[PDB]
Ligand binder design. Structure first.
Ligand SMILES: CC(=O)CCCOP(=O)(O)OP(=O)(O)O
Ligand code: F3S
Length: 309
């Protein structure tokens, strides 16, 4: 059985920064360090950090006065940041710079009292945080997930309307939502294409190339990671069996019995050691040396804040 590796796969710049922010806070201040939400949606990263003294919370009312709190890579609403800001908390912000870019646009629209539409998945922490930058009652902030959501939306003033997106969506499905937005609201203003980040776009391009060669695709990533779910979905729509797995123990022998070419990729939040262990298991199941596909080069790094060097 041949094993192919997607390229790029695995950690993006935002995830490497966010994990380093927690690790470095632990090293400088000691345990406990509180983190608002899983720093990234990866069960191995979050358990690793817990075992070193990070405490993951959903609400600020879970954090003691005077504590160090880090916001996760997904970002937080103004209400959350003010709830921390009003309390005693030393805050470090691990929000990805590519989410912060979107938040600055929503904040600009709110200050103008002009309505904004976000494309994104309801209940996702990044959507909470981005919707949560809009505060002006004179405008409005609306969420859409699909063309049908666009077809039913009504707004106060469609001559003064803009759109933003979540960073970890399907490039293809998002393109269809944007086409519906522009047909419904021909004066709508937005980015050239979407706010989907380089890492999401590149891993989807890479898994497409992988799925063109591989009969089965394994995506290393956790169930609650949107970008990792998009990679599995994309291979499945190409007609390949694709499985989202947290680690090598999840691999069922039937999925690769008789398969001549298995492909492996990993979401932006999944560490490379997980992929190495998956490759080791596929080898026990008859695979050979893993062959990385040629891929688009990535060269972006985001540094930790100077406070945490
Ligand atoms: C800022 C982000 O939304 C991406 C963070 C890294 O990936 P992950 O934590 O898996 O988040 P998603 O659920 O958005 O893919
Ligand atoms: S928004 Fe940032 S955290 Fe990663 S998946 Fe994209 S570079």
């Amino acid at each position: 059985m041949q094993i192919l590796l997607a390229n790029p796969r695995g950690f993006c710049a935002g995830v490497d920064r966010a994990i380093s922010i927690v690790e470095n806070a632990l090293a400088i201040y000691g345990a406990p360090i509180y983190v608002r939400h899983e720093v990234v949606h990866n069960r191995y990263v979050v358990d690793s950090l817990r075992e070193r003294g990070a405490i993951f919370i959903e609400q600020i009312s879970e954090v003691p006065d005077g504590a160090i709190l880090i916001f996760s890579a997904h970002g937080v609403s103004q209400a959350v940041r003010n709830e921390a800001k009003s309390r005693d908390l030393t805050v470090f912000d691990a929000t990805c710079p590519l989410v912060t870019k979107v938040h600055m646009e929503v904040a600009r629209a709110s200050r103008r009292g002009e309505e904004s539409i976000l494309i994104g998945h309801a209940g996702h922490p990044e959507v909470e945080g981005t919707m949560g930058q809009y505060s002006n009652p004179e405008g409005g902030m609306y969420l859409v997930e699909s063309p049908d959501d666009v077809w039913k939306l009504t707004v106060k003033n469609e001559e003064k309307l803009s759109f933003m997106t979540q960073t970890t969506l399907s490039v293809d499905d998002t393109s269809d939502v944007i086409d519906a937005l522009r047909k419904r609201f021909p004066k709508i203003v937005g980015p050239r294409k979407d706010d989907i980040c380089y890492a999401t776009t590149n891993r989807q391009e890479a898994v497409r190339a992988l799925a063109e060669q591989a009969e089965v695709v394994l995506v290393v990533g956790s169930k609650n990671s949107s970008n990792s779910n998009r990679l599995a979905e994309l291979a499945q729509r190409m007609g390949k069996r694709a499985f989202l797995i947290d680690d090598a123990k999840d691999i069922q022998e039937e999925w690769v019995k008789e398969v001549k070419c298995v492909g492996v990729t990993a979401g932006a939040s999944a560490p490379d050691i997980l992929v190495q262990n998956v490759v080791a298991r596929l080898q026990q199941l008859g695979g050979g040396e893993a062959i990385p596909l040629e891929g688009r080069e990535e060269n972006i790094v985001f540094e930790v804040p100077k406070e945490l060097r």
